[PDB]
Write a structure and sequence with these properties.
Largest interface: D-F, 54 and 47 residues
Largest sheet of chain A: none
Catalytic activity (chain D): a ubiquinone + NADH + 5 H(+)(in) = a ubiquinol + NAD(+) + 4 H(+)(out)
Strand content of chain A: under 5%
Oligomer: part of a larger assembly
InterPro entries (chain D): NADH4_N, NADH_Q_OxRdtase_chainM/4, NADH_UbQ_OxRdtase, ND/Mrp_TM
Number of helices of chain A: 3
Number of helices of chain E: 4
Order of helices and strands of chain E: HHHH
Enzyme class (chain D): translocase
Chains: A mainly alpha (155), B mainly alpha (37), C mainly alpha (177), D mainly alpha (459), E mainly alpha (128), F mainly alpha (606)
Pfam families (chain D): Oxidored_q5_N, Proton_antipo_M
Bound molecules: cardiolipin, 1,2-diacyl-SN-glycero-3-phosphocholine, 1,2-Distearoyl-sn-glycerophosphoethanolamine
Order of helices and strands of chain A: HHH
Structural class of chain A: mainly alpha
Largest sheet of chain E: none
Number of strands of chain A: 0
Membrane topology (chain D): Multi-pass membrane protein
Shape of chain A: elongated
Distance between the termini of chain E: 67 Å
Distance between the termini of chain A: 97 Å
Helix content of chain A: 25-40%
Radius of gyration of chain E: 30 Å
Number of strands of chain E: 0
Chain lengths: 155, 37, 177, 459, 128, 606
């Protein structure tokens, strides 16, 4: 490996852009760098942010698990777009509609659990009745004190 | 239209070498040669 | 889109791939074989309706709205074959697909356990390394200037030559080791 | 302590008078004898530290760091003998001399009864480390990394020199045993504020503190394997040792001076661990993991509760063993692919099963799997910082998610998946490399049986 | 008619629904042929080294070396401190430090005020 | 005392012995899986003696046999709690695990890492019986993280497959999010009660138990796959079938339910925790049973089945009925392990076919698998006096007759109908109808391993609810008086589920094609929860892990402010000092300016 095959500064002349595209092994009309706002990308290509899951799986890849070739310019976030991580693959339902359905379902369920908590069900009975002054010694009451007389009657 | 004659010839030659390799993956009746237990 | 030999998909290939994916996603929608059989013949009739369209603009437009039709009407979890990418058994046995060169790094006590196998492997390695220079000089005499245009490889041309770049296709591991 | 300093110095004639093929075996043998001798430091009492002389003592904080330090030298000799096999014999003996000299400085850094002698040995440890990194490092950036390692430590520690000499002039002594009984409460002033900063920022750099940690993903990465082992396993823990000594003299001002730095650690362990999720260099991933683990030790020392000191010294010993093993595993793959890119060599469990099991155990101890002493230290620090503030558990708990996430991703990227096709120089694992992994991991798992010896002076 | 597919950041547009896939113009043919040519050249250059029996080592990928150098070494020489980097470095760097500082400071002022006034239940709390 | 405690510890030491055997080996084994299966059968036989002498007297004890570590007031010891829960759960786990391993001696027979597989499965069993027999929070945390790590190692069994490693790291992710709350609970108990032992927790009986119970509910959400932290359990089917049968149906996934059952004296006095558990379990048993209505992979259907049953277990904890929840665990283990075993027998007979749209005609083809699958689905739906009747029905008879969140009750009943719907979905697409699998029929099930292993759990699924529910002592007062519509509620809703789903099944034979509506795409794509939250929350992490943390702070700004500004300052001052033209005139003119400033401007002559 040598110096002019390593990434360099941001290309500003079109011949430096062509040398950059020749360096990253891709077409000059396909080569697009990151916008020069000073984030440290330099001349590195802005690939269109596709996950490696979206690649053709039946192709005889050089790296089949990564779905990536030798000499192919990797994405800046190639560690992020592996098939073990963030997938950008197309979904049969729209993303905004998925967010609407999920947020509406979760919010409706939370609201209806709050409605059921505000208006709870019960059985048409009285309280459960316990002897010995509502079980004063069993619940941990001290025997030197004396509770108020809880007396239940027959019915 | 299927394969070109170059591709057909290459797949036939690769098929022959592949079947030779896979047949030569078989074992001998003396193999595995185990140590004296 | 992305193919090793061709640089693109033709219109005919796009129609065939849409036809196959439409039948597969329809079969996912149409679980039973007689009901899929009926609706698959109806879908074949729909594909055979606009078969003889000579205007490539109109044909490309019909293909595009047929893709819109399919994307609106696809199964969410379609049927995938088990060893197909996305299936339940896809790339399952890749943890057993040990490459061949590891056999070169065995100890002699376990190479001598299989005498005929390695005695037969040495002539494979011999045939490979005396075929290598002939197939390299085959590749550098047939490739045009500017590099190869497609990823296709030539066959063997002589009686005695092996096809160029053959070793990792012939000596790939089995799918069930 | 002179029964350890003199054998460590007799390791210099033992490596310079040896036959040319015996200079690894002799140093390994006699350094393992010194490491077996190191167990006599376990004569610790519940009230008094093991006080030897006017110059040396050893409490239950310095004792496990000493045993780890004297154990680390044979492991560094086993680690560094393969890639220095084509080296000249004189430079090979000089490398062994630098390792022996660094052990020599460390064993009387942790046993310094007096703090300016602690400073002299604490900054004496720079020079063999600097020479090892900037001389036997592999890549170009070892020189710049040695510069950053030297000038963060010296810029933090030259105010520590003035602060310690000020304590010598004010209190009269810098003996730690005297200052246990002559400590005055440090009141609130700007003078005492910069007193606190001058006493603390050197150890903040050596831990490292987040924001000041920029030397470490260069110094640990550009070092050789023995340099990375001693930098991760011991030389970070000088900062925790020194903070646990020097916060005796910084009360009650620490109770309101620690507030920014705790934030810098409680956020720093969220950041650096997150950085470990996107590191392509595996050795840098282990470096940022070391920063993330030492952030908890900084928090635990700055909240200065007993559970926090017990958990912090258990985390220091446990992280020393675990991080040393992780650097040795990364070296075991670097000696087969000659690159440190983590995505390069994949699927290594298909080729190296027992070495993959060593990766598995080092990753499980990295993610604090109970009952490892990793988890004992991690858990006790989390207990003490829940007592400090009940919201910190969020910053703790999310960390314990992310600490799992890169600990297994490192296991999944390197050991699992499909193996790389074109890499065919993946040799079978040597007996030396598996010996190195086992001598890291088996003491670490034996310390789960009897962890009270690595829980510090206030067990 | 049918609801049109809305592509998102995490849900890309399919190739089949893409209009620019259907470009039959000759400049797209030249682009696809030139990309096929570059990919075929890199494929050939790889598998000549990959099938070589004399090679026993690592086929070095300068794309991977170039990526690992771009992620680490080339970041600071291509950094420019301007308005955007300053606001993102001061918003994401010292922002949460200030946030967690005021959260933990307010919580500990509240807790110390409850403890020193005899309000917080600290009955069995003797481990700390 | 001498018999009970000895055979208690003999069970665990016996289970640890084949780990020592596989670690101390040199040779090729004489069927090490048979050795581990014989060991676990012997462990079941051994552990039945303390269970029978618990059924006799109610004999409970604590074996705090080994002092481990005293952190100043916290004496952590190796302490095993032999109460009702351990005495009922250890023989059930050993019986189920013995059936799973005799299944695995046939199913995993072609695997050249079969000894490693049985090693990992025994390590799972050792960690789980460490979990359920634990007396303090540290030992329970050991068993907790142990079953999490063995879940990792057994989901990612075929580790070359990317999806298995992805699902294994996903399972670790959701479990550690639950572990946040588990360690929160441990922190609260140490700081406010000075204990990790359960006895001092129960005897002190804290009143302000909102926060530790929130931590325990979060831990059970992560471990027992409740809503919000659910998708790892259907992802966990990516491992082998006996992994899903043992770990991810019956044994590991009930550990968060077991955690909230273990702290029942703290939940029987906290109504807020009961309401939170009730709403969360009702949400889970609605959502997962709704997702199971439309799935086609058979292991995913049975995974949503067992997560819906875990939601029902969370419900019956939340109505302050913890012993019914534990009875339902011990009941549910039998038929859900058998449903996974029968599904995997179908999968093996159809050459790794798991999609139910390529099944069918297996009624007469696999008659023992058919019989056991029908008995398992009837035990799942609560056919009367099969094993699932003896807990689940009673659960409904307590869920109706109690002061309860009524929306939780209605969603519990809708879940009860959905159980019947997906059970007859399994029976309709796998057994009934005509074949849909390919033409090379290799249907075979005649191994005595397979037959005997499904046979013992079949006898369990017939008789175990009766045997256990008659042998256990009463721990509550069962509500048995209720009106006729309220007694027959679960059976009527279950029969309505069967009838409605038979109608839905017979509508598929028509020659009519309908477009997929948004309800079908919502239930088929898993409520959109693994689609959004697995694409968005990693994204929002990892850009923040690189564009903010890695590149912006620790490669630029923290590198800019301290070293680079100071280094450029020293370089610039060095270039200003040493930029002298060498002229003697200028140096002496500077000396004159020096003397003038020293005299007039600084007064150094005074
Ligand atoms: C003082 C006397 C003490 C005596 C008792 C010692 C106690 C144990 C100490 C530590 C033991 C570590 C050694 C084994 C692992 C490393 C080597 C290895 O992998 O070998 C594989 C090999 C067998 O496999 P193989 O097929 O040949 O090759 C491997 C394959 O390639 C493929 O590999 P694989 O992945 O399939 O197989 C690896 C597998 C992979 O499995 C896992 O990774 C799963 C493990 C984690 C989850 C399950 C456990 C969770 C926690 C519960 C257990 C602890 C608490 C239990 C207590 C009750 C409850 C509180 O791991 C195991 O099988 C190990 C089982 C035991 C695990 C112990 C916990 C380690 C986990 C990480 C740390 C956790 C916290 C600390 C725990 C400390 C415990 C002491 O084993 C050997 O050859 C063993 C050689 C001899 C080992 C001696 C160990 C002690 C040496 C100390 C010397 C000085 C003292 C004298 C005592 C000597 C005693 C003999
Ligand atoms: C790694 C990079 C960061 C390193 C950070 C190092 C610590 C940061 C703060 C250091 C301050 C300087 C040392 C203070 C020593 C205090 C000792 C003492 O007795 O103090 C009380 C004394 C008080 O005097 P006194 O004690 O004689 O007074 C008697 C007592 N009273 C007050 C009651 C009358 O403090 C001072 O005299 C001055 C203290 C502040 C000094 C300011 C000058 C230095 C500026 C900061 C430099 C920081 C490092 C620069 C390099 C950075 C990288 C290139
Ligand atoms: C196959 C070989 C088997 C063994 C062969 C040799 C023995 C043959 C049979 C005869 C029995 C021998 C005599 C009895 C044994 C000795 C009795 C005795 O007093 O032993 C001293 C002690 C008993 O405890 P103790 O309380 O006396 O001592 C503890 C030490 N102090 C007090 C300082 C803390 O130790 C043992 O018994 C050691 C073995 C314990 C068994 C369980 C080990 C589990 C390891 C787990 C590690 C991680 C746990 C982390 C979590 C813990 C919980 C929070
Ligand atoms: C009792 C109350 C109960 C309350 C419940 C609700 C509260 C929690 C809210 C949800 C939080 C968890 C869910 C969000 C993160 C899920 C991440 C995950 O699992 O990603 C899986 C993803 C692959 O998934 P998938 O694509 O399905 O795999 C098949 C392959 N085609 O894998 C990847 O993409 C790999 C990603 C690796 C890096 C992970 C980055 C994200 C980490 C997120 C940590 C969040 C911690 C939150 C802590 C809060 C504490 C209060
Ligand atoms: C970048 C890399 C990563 C970061 C590494 C660490 C960098 C930061 C290190 C120093 C952080 C600040 C010092 C710690 C603050 C602790 C509390 C404190 O002193 O607050 C500042 C002070 C508060 O006021 P008060 O406490 O009343 O002051 C009178 C004291 N008797 O406030 C004031 O009085 C107002 C401000 C006055 C000027 C302060 C400057 C001196 C202190 C910093 C040096
Ligand atoms: C503020 C701001 O926008 O500063 C811009 C200035 C460069 O100005 P420019 O945009 O080039 O015109 O940029 C500068 O002057 C340099 C940076 C200004 C100060 C930033 C301080 C905080 C930086 C992040 C620290 C993270 C730790
Ligand atoms: C359990 C008690 C079963 C008996 C009482 C309920 C009877 C009933 O409502 O049966 C309705 C129905 C059978 O009738 P149907 O399916 O409409 O007829 C098709 C031609 N055989 O459906 C059935 O009988 C099938 C559902 C039985 C559910 C059993 C498990 C609960
Ligand atoms: C936290 C503390 C932050 C400050 C730590 C000290 C500065 C940073 C570390 C040392 C410098 C690191 C570095 O890379 O310096 C290189 C730079 C240019 O040197 P150059 O000749 O280009 O390099 C050799 C040939 N390539 O060298 C320079 O620009 C000059 C560097 C001088 C460093 C002197 C430090 C003195 C600190 C106190 C100043 C008062």
């Amino acid at each position: 490996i040598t110096k002019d095959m390593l990434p360099g500064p941001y290309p500003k002349t079109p011949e430096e852009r062509a040398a950059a595209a020749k360096k990253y092994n891709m077409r000059v009309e396909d080569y697009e760098p990151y916008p020069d706002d000073g984030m440290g990308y330099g001349d590195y290509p802005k690939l269109p942010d596709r996950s490696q899951q979206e690649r053709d799986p039946w192709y005889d890849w050089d790296h089949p698990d990564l779905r990536l070739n030798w000499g192919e310019p990797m994405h800046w976030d190639l560690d992020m777009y592996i098939r073990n991580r963030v997938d950008t693959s197309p979904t049969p339902v729209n993303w905004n509609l998925m967010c609407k359905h999920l947020f509406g379902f979760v919010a409706f369920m939370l609201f209806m659990f709050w409605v059921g908590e505000t208006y709870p069900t019960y059985q048409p009975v009285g309280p459960k009745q316990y002897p010995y002054n509502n079980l004063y010694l069993e619940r941990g009451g001290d025997p030197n004190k004396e509770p108020e007389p809880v007396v239940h009657y027959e019915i | 239209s299927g394969y070109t004659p170059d591709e057909k010839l290459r797949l036939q030659q690769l098929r022959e070498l592949r079947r030779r390799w896979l047949k030569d993956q078989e074992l001998s009746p003396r193999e595995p040669v185990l140590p004296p237990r | 889109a992305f193919l090793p030999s061709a640089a693109y998909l033709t219109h005919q290939q796009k129609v065939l791939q849409l036809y196959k994916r439409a039948l597969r996603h329809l079969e996912s929608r149409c679980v039973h074989r007689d009901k899929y059989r009926y609706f698959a013949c109806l879908l074949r009739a729909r594909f055979d309706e606009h078969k003889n369209e000579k205007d490539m603009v109109k044909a490309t437009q019909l293909l595009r709205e047929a893709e819109k039709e399919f994307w609106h009407g696809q199964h969410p979890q379609p049927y995938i074959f088990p060893e197909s990418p996305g299936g339940t058994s896809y790339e399952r046995y890749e943890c057993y697909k040990v490459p061949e060169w590891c056999l070169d790094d065995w100890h002699p006590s376990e190479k001598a356990m299989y005498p005929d196998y390695f005695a037969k492997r040495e002539q494979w390695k011999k045939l490979r390394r005396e075929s290598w220079e002939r197939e390299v000089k085959q590749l550098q005499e047939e490739t045009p200037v500017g590099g190869p245009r497609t990823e296709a490889l030539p066959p063997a041309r002589k009686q005695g030559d092996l096809p160029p770049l053959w070793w990792h296709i012939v000596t790939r591991p089995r799918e069930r080791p | 302590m002179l029964k350890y300093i003199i054998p460590t110095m007799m390791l210099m004639p033992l490596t310079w008078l040896s036959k040319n093929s015996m200079i690894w075996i002799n140093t390994t043998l006699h350094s393992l004898l010194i490491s077996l001798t190191s167990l006599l430091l376990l004569n610790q009492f519940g009230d008094n530290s093991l006080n030897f002389s006017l110059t040396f003592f050893s409490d239950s904080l310095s004792t496990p760091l000493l045993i780890l330090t004297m154990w680390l030298l044979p492991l560094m000799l086993m680690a560094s003998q393969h890639h220095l096999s084509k080296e000249n014999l004189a430079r090979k003996k000089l490398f062994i001399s630098m390792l022996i000299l660094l052990q020599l400085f460390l064993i009387m850094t942790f046993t310094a009864t007096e703090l300016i002698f602690f400073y002299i040995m604490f900054e004496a440890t720079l020079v063999p480390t600097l020479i090892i990194i900037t001389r036997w490092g592999n890549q170009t950036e070892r020189l710049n990394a040695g510069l950053y390692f030297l000038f963060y430590t010296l810029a933090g520690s030259l105010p520590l020199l003035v602060a310690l000499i000020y304590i010598q002039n004010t209190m009269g002594s810098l003996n730690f045993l005297i200052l246990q009984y002559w400590v005055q409460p440090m009141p609130n002033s700007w003078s005492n504020t910069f007193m606190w900063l001058a006493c603390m920022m050197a150890f903040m750099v050596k831990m490292p503190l987040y924001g000041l940690h920029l030397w470490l993903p260069k110094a640990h990465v550009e070092a050789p394997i023995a340099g990375s082992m001693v930098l991760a396993a011991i030389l970070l823990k000088l900062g925790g040792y020194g903070m646990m000594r020097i916060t005796l003299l910084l009360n009650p001002i620490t109770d309101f001076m620690a507030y920014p730095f705790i934030m810098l650690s409680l956020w720093g362990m969220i950041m650096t661990s997150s950085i470990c999720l996107r590191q392509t260099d595996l050795k840098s991933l282990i470096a940022y993991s070391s920063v993330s683990h030492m952030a908890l030790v900084i928090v635990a020392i700055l909240i200065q509760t007993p559970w926090s000191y017990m958990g912090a010294t258990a985390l220091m010993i446990a992280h020393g063993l675990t991080s040393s093993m992780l650097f040795c595993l990364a070296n075991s793959n670097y000696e087969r692919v000659h690159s440190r890119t983590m995505i390069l060599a994949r699927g290594l469990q298909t080729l190296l099963p027992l070495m993959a099991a060593w990766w598995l155990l080092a990753s499980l101890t990295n993610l604090a799997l109970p009952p490892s002493i990793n988890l004992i230290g991690e858990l006790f620090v989390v207990m003490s910082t829940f007592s400090w503030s009940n919201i910190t558990i969020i910053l703790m708990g999310l960390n314990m998610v992310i600490t799992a996430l890169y600990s297994l991703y490192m296991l999944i990227t390197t050991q699992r998946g499909k193996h790389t096709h074109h890499i065919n120089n993946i040799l079978p694992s040597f007996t030396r490399e598996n010996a190195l992994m086992s001598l890291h991991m088996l003491p670490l798992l034996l310390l789960s049986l009897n962890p009270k010896i690595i829980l510090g002076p206030l067990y | 008619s049918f609801p049109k597919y809305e592509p998102s950041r995490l849900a890309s547009l399919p190739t089949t629904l893409d209009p620019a896939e259907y470009d039959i113009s000759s400049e797209t043919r030249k682009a696809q042929a030139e990309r096929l040519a570059i990919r075929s050249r890199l494929k050939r250059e790889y598998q000549l080294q990959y099938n070589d029996p004399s090679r026993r080592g690592v086929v070095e990928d300068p794309a991977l070396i170039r990526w690992t150098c771009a992620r680490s070494a080339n970041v600071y020489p291509n950094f420019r401190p301007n308005t955007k980097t300053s606001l993102l470095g001061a918003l994401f760097g010292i922002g949460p430090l200030i946030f967690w500082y005021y959260v933990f400071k307010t919580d500990r002022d509240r807790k110390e005020k409850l403890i020193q006034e005899g309000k917080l239940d600290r009955t069995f709390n003797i481990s700390y | 005392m001498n018999l009970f405690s000895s055979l208690t510890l003999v069970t665990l030491i016996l289970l640890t012995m084949p780990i020592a055997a596989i670690n101390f080996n040199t040779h090729k084994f004489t069927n090490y899986p048979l050795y581990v299966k014989t060991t676990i059968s012997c462990a079941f036989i051994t552990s039945m003696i303390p269970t029978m002498m618990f059924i006799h007297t109610g004999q409970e004890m604590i074996i705090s046999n080994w002092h481990w570590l005293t952190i100043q007031t916290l004496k952590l010891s190796l302490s095993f709690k032999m109460d009702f829960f351990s005495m009922m759960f250890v023989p059930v786990a050993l019986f189920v695990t013995w059936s799973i391993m005799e299944f695995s001696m046939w199913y995993m027979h072609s695997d050249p890492n079969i000894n490693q597989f049985f090693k990992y499965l025994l390590l799972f069993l050792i960690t789980m019986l460490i979990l359920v027999t634990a007396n303090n929070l540290f030992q329970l945390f050991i068993g907790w993280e142990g079953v999490g790590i063995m879940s990792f190692l057994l989901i990612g069994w075929w580790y070359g497959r990317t999806d298995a490693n992805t699902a294994a790291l996903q399972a670790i992710l959701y479990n550690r999010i639950g572990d946040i709350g588990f360690i929160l609970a441990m922190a609260w108990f140490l700081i406010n009660l000075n204990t990790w032992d359960l006895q001092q927790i129960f005897m002190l009986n804290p009143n302000d138990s909102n926060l530790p119970l929130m931590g325990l509910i979060l831990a059970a959400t992560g471990k027992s796959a409740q809503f919000g932290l659910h998708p790892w359990l259907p992802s966990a089917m990516e491992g082998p079938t006996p992994v899903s049968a043992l770990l991810h149906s019956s044994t590991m996934v009930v550990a968060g339910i077991f955690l909230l059952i273990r702290f029942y004296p703290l939940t029987e006095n906290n109504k807020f925790g009961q309401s939170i558990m009730l709403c969360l379990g009702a949400m889970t048993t609605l959502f997962t049973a709704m997702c199971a209505l439309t799935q086609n992979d058979i292991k995913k259907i049975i995974a949503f089945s067992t997560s819906s049953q875990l939601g029902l277990m969370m419900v019956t904890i939340g109505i302050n009925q913890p012993h019914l929840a534990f009875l339902h665990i011990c009941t549910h283990a039998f038929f859900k392990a058998m449903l996974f075993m029968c599904s995997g027998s179908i999968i093996h007979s159809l050459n790794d076919e798991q999609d139910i749209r390529k099944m069918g005609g297996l009624f007469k083809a696999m008659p023992f698998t058919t019989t056991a699958l029908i008995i398992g689905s009837l035990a799942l739906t609560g056919m009367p006096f099969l094993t699932g009747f003896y807990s689940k029905d009673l659960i409904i008879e307590s869920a109706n007759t109690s002061y309860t969140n009524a929306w939780a009750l209605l969603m519990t009943l809708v879940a009860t109908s959905f159980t019947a719907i997906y059970s007859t979905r399994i029976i309709f697409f796998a057994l009934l109808g005509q074949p849909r699998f390919p033409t090379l029929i290799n249907i075979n099930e005649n191994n005595p391993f397979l037959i005997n292993s499904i046979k013992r759990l079949l006898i369990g699924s017939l008789f175990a609810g009766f045997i256990i529910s008659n042998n256990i002592p009463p721990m509550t007062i069962p509500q048995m008086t209720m009106p006729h519509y309220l007694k027959m509620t679960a059976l009527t809703v279950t029969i309505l589920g069967f009838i409605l789903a038979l109608e839905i099944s017979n509508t598929t034979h028509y020659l009519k094609f309908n477009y997929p509506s948004n309800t079908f795409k919502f239930s088929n794509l898993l409520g959109y929860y693994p689609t959004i939250m697995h694409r968005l929350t990693p994204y929002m992490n990892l850009t923040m892990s690189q564009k903010s943390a890695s590149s912006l702070l620790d490669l630029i700004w923290l590198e800019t402010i301290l070293p680079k500004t100071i280094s450029l300052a020293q370089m610039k001052m060095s270039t200003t000092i040493t930029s002298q033209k060498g002229l003697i005139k200028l140096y002496f003119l500077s000396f004159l300016i020096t003397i003038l400033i020293s005299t007039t401007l600084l007064n150094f002559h005074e």
